């Protein structure tokens, strides 16, 4: 067979240790999920420094905690806008998830509070910028570089899916690079705790599985399709299905013909055909062996999964950081004042925040 006695026993033991870990992780998640935290700071505790970008909803600002000098990334959501856009449930759910999860590649929520006009989520500042920026700057990542990032996403989805969470918005724009070169997943605006099948048309067009586009329901395997898209984009420099407008992108995905650059390795092409697989009876991540079909694939043969988790692998790219609050790894955005009305808005709708 493919493994002798020693290697087979080792792999079996490693897989049982993952199960033990995930059982403890679910216990801890559920305690926080059922009893969230709230109201752990206020706006005038922070200096507003610079806009870093926009999330799924609202903008993200670099801020500095006045009493400690620590820097954070603060997401600001306009309650009236959120109501108008039918995003009340999404914003409450995002904060609920963030305060309940705990994993080394998920951004951590440090404070949250609200006022008359806005909701605020104060998260760790990840100063190395978006993977999107670095990818567009150097064109494409060599396969070991892509693999290092991909392994972190595999472990992160393994964790999230054990909690019945589907992420639904994987893309380089949503992946920040920390000072050690590791990835942080930042935005949970479209994530959902789902027992099994769900139907919502949501996510980012290029990353949507065919079953999201089509009327049929779908499950957590859409995230494994999205991983395929991310690995392809990292290694090629462009995603597998593209066009000028969403409806045209959807047609390409459903038509489903994937072609690969000639520099892709055979191992990479095999992995991607098994992730970008329209047939759910065949898609990796969705079979009897679960995530192990991905982790044990030849393309990941050199990946030490525990060493990635323990952040002991040397990263392929270390961002340049010039002191606290340096924003040199971020684009510039239009700066809009943070207005706080004399009158409370939408109070009843956001009680739980």
């Amino acid at each position: 067979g493919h493994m002798g006695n020693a290697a087979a026993a080792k792999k079996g033991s490693e897989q049982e240790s993952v199960k033990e870990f995930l059982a403890k992780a679910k216990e801890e998640f559920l305690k926080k999920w059922e009893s969230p935290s709230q109201n752990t700071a206020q706006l005038d505790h922070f200096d507003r420094i610079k806009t870093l970008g926009t999330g799924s909803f609202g903008r993200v600002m670099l801020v500095k905690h006045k009493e400690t000098g620590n820097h954070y990334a603060m997401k600001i959501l306009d309650k009236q806008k959120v109501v108008k856009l039918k995003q009340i449930e999404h914003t409450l759910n995002e904060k609920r998830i963030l305060q309940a999860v705990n994993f080394p590649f998920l951004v951590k929520l440090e404070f949250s509070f609200k006022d008359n006009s806005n909701l605020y989520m104060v998260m760790e500042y990840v100063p190395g910028g978006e993977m999107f920026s670095h990818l567009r700057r150097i064109g494409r990542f060599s396969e070991p570089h892509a693999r290092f990032y991909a392994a972190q996403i595999v472990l992160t989805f393994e964790y999230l899916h054990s909690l019945d969470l589907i992420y639904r918005d994987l893309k380089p724009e949503n992946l920040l690079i920390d000072q050690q070169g590791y990835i942080q997943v930042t935005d949970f605006g479209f994530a959902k705790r789902v027992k099994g099948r769900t139907w919502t048309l949501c996510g980012t067009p290029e990353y949507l599985a065919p079953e999201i586009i089509l009327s049929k329901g779908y499950n957590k395997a859409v995230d494994w399709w999205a991983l395929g898209v991310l690995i392809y984009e990292m290694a090629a420099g462009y995603p597998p299905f593209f066009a000028d407008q969403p409806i045209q992108i959807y047609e390409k995905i459903v038509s489903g013909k994937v072609r690969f650059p000639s520099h892709f390795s055979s191992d990479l092409k095999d992995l991607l055909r098994n992730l970008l697989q329209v047939d759910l009876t065949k898609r990796f991540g969705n079979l009897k062996n679960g995530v192990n079909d991905i982790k044990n694939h030849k393309w990941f043969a050199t990946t030490d999964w525990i060493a990635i988790y323990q952040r002991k692998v040397e990263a392929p790219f270390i961002p340049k950081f010039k002191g606290p609050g340096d924003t040199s790894n971020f684009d510039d955005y239009e700066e809009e004042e943070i207005r706080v009305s004399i009158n409370e808005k939408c109070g009843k709708e956001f009680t739980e925040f």
Partner: peptide
Amino acid sequence: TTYADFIASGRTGRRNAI
């Protein structure tokens, strides 16, 4: 080339969710 086609008509900047 596929890359030329991406620059010509793919979305090359940041992509919003739907």
